[PDB]
Symmetry: D2
């Protein structure tokens, strides 16, 4: 995965963006892990698509890579848990608590217990530290701000947050150059095979 190879991906990213292949752009972002699209991450957070959010994140970091990463996954999963409590889906809330939040219990036993106990409140805002929680829309925006600091501060996201300035259609431009080089033999088609000039 050399620097030239990695730069080819950015060129592909640009090309995909120009053809309006949106999902492909973000899958490529995620699977290559070369560029974290902060703007895309925001949209998905506001939309509360938490599965997509974590899946995208996993292209860049794991929960225990460092404490910035672990604080990021925690805030996401905490918000997910609270939203379930707020719609009174207790069953889903319990599922989130065992499947997503337990990994954090080893690191703070008392915090996990306190999180667990919110299940038995009729409204979780009765808890002092959550008392100022607004509605769903309000909580996501607030948490999004905290997610950004964590990401921007995170060592693993350092040089992945700004897309290089490029001239439009750069990949296409490189392809024209390669086509001209096949005509270098100039005695006067396709991209799949080299052009063969008739002599």
């Amino acid at each position: 995965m050399s620097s030239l190879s990695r730069e080819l991906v950015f060129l592909i990213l640009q090309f995909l963006d120009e053809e309006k292949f949106k999902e492909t752009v973000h899958k490529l972002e995620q699977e290559s892990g070369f560029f974290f699209n902060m703007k895309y991450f925001e949209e998905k957070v506001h939309a509360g698509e938490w599965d997509e959010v974590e899946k995208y994140l996993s292209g860049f970091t794991k929960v225990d890579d460092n404490r910035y990463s672990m604080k990021i996954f925690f805030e996401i999963r905490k918000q997910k848990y609270l939203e379930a409590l707020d719609r009174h889906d207790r069953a889903k809330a319990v599922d989130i608590l065992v499947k997503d939040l337990k990994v954090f219990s080893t690191f703070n036993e008392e915090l996990y217990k306190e999180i667990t106990q919110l299940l038995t409140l009729e409204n979780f805002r009765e808890n002092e530290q959550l008392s100022k929680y607004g509605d769903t829309k309000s909580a996501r925006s607030i948490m999004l701000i905290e997610l950004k600091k964590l990401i921007e501060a995170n060592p693993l996201f350092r040089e992945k947050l700004v897309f290089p300035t490029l001239k439009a259609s750069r990949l296409r431009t490189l392809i024209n150059q390669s086509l001209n080089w096949q005509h270098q033999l100039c005695k006067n088609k396709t991209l799949f095979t080299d052009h063969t000039c008739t002599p």
Copy 2:
């Protein structure tokens, strides 16, 4: 698109496959609609990932484009329904029957009533036409045999099932050719970027 632009997408598909960016490959297949990957389709069907199956499918066709597509979406949704019955999740079975299969009742009302009536059997295999139904993996495979024919017969799919023959790393090959072009005129020479054209150091 463009006729050459379209070939560039295939080169990108090949590049992505070699870098092992698998999900990207199939999203690109789906969003471009240029190549239907039958092998990928088979895995997702055996795996019963029905949302992914339909999502991938939607890059190539809509449910009511032609009767081959109709049959494809109907067989998938029927199997999904039977599986819900087989795991005794009747709420889920009814949900599927209303949300996924109801669109088909217009075209055959009696078929829809009969599928609905499977809800009240203690085992749907008591029904004659399902009497040879196996388990989940056998039903998926047998249904898969049927989906492949429908796809192969489907006008919207038949020129999309064969990937063009290529030497490995063709995009990379082209990129090196393009690097040879920028350095073509450079006497007095003396590792480069792809973002901007290279400038020859003068004497």
Copy 3:
């Protein structure tokens, strides 16, 4: 022990009703099977307590005793099913459909398929025959009017729908009579006297 035994149960019913042991009254009605309380039945139906409704009915009749009984159970279970559909509890609706309504498919196969099909409707009123249904309260009332006629027509309830006219506390009156006999039987009837227990006959000397 036969006809008096049946009359003693009615006296217990009156005694229990006077002591306000209400659940006990209706358990006795149900288990003896001697008196069907239409009024209590109406309350349970209006309240939608279908498990109790069927439980109480089952003390008097079974689903296949005759066509009047079968039709009573069918209307009850039908209404019960529709209510599950109306609150969009689909699991419960299918469960009612499989456990309770399947017994009727034998006697009418096409009807059962049509009831099954209500599951795929966005609202059961899309079915022509159910289209004029009002709210749940209204549907229970309308159904109750028909059930009432079915019970009144059903031979198996003959003699079970009218409570005998009685003087209040008739069981108590009898016990005092039995106590007056326990003194007569006894020596020269010294008063008052205090009466000791009902468990054993009273002694004198």
Copy 4:
């Protein structure tokens, strides 16, 4: 002296028992509150009929009457909760915890937190205090032994656990007496006559 009534109720209990009207017997026990049937209570606990158990108990006591009662109800609802965890129905387990067990949190907040935390274990037997818990059948049996003790110590059940010893069919005998007091009052009866009803006194043909 509603002292004889309380005895008439017992005669009816006996009469109902002899007629095999079983459900009627226990409703009378429950609604009168005069006799707590421990044998029946045991059967309902072993079968896990928890709604019937609480429904029956409630004829004799409420959850907050005294500390034995509150504890009886706590043991029942705890076991009910654990069984829900053991069948992996967590939606039900949380449901039991909020509706049934929360009333006890006031009195021991820390205990309630510990019980709540059982939700996040793979198995509640991982908890030190539950580690010797067997299956549903043994657990009910163990807890039943404790419930029997608690009921026996509870002042509200004090004079209610022993059925008076009676001659069989006592109510019938009394009715026959109420009947012998009938053909007597006139009197011209040679054969004991056909007795008409219990609903009205018999008529003496003078």
